[PDB]
Amino acid sequence: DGVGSSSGNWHCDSQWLGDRVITTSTRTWALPTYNNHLYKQISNSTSGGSSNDNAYFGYSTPWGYFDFNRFHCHFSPRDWQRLINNNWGFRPKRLNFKLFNIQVK
Amino acid sequence: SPLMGGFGMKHPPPQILIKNTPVPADPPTAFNKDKLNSFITQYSTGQVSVEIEWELQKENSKRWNPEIQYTSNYYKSNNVEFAVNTEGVYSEPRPIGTRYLTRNL
Known part of the structure; x- marks a missing residue:
């Protein structure tokens, strides 16, 4: 939209329906410049590794990534307690993801 | 509110009264005006259901930390709480209240 208008609101809550629970979590993030905008070949030689079992070859990218693959990223301790004390099972169904209020310094 | 605990009502559930109808024994063959005092010994049995x-x-x-909850103790014991003994006697080992969850004042 514009410089002076927020592009999203803070949504962080849990909604408990009959057979469904909807968890929403919002966090503030910071993203630096990685590898000074470069791709770099990496290996156990570059990191000083010696053992065969820990040898590797790969690349480090200037990109970051968002990870929310831990349960506490979505469930508060009270919500987790409710889930574990009141249900025989659970599974994820669908996902909604948002990035907003971008600020570059 | 009843001082012993519970719900106070002007019109609570009505009293349900039950009695075995007296069955007189053999009366004398000559009229006697006195009320009969010889009855067949009787008792009754049946099922009662209340829903x-x-x-x-x-x-x-919106509390973040987990609440206090009533729970059984996993530690081994000779008998299961709120179950029958080896002689078939059911027992309630402790009084259970209702106030474990919390809310603001």
Whole structure:
């Protein structure tokens, strides 16, 4: 939209329906410049590794990534307690993801 | 509110009164005006069913840390709490209240 208008609101809550629970979590993030905008070949030689079992070859990218693959990223301790004390099972169904209020310094 | 605990009502569930109808024994062959005092020894048995619908007030707390909950103790014991003994005697090992969840004042 514009410089002076927020592009999203803070949504962080849990909604408990009959057979469904909807968890929403919002966090503030910071993203630096990685590898000074470069791709770099990496290996156990570059990191000083010696053992065969820990040898590797790969690349480090200037990109970051968002990870929310831990349960506490979505469930508060009270919500987790409710889930574990009141249900025989659970599974994820669908996902909604948002990035907003971008600020570059 | 009843001082021993519970719900006070001007019109509570009505008293349900039951009695075995007296069955006189053999009366004398000559009329006697006195009330009969010789009856057949009797008793009755049967089944009784009561169904009560309860309305629930769900909790909508925003508390972050887990609540206190009533729970059985996993530690080994000779008998299971709220179960029968080896002689078939059912027992209630402790009084259980209702106030474990929390809310602000």
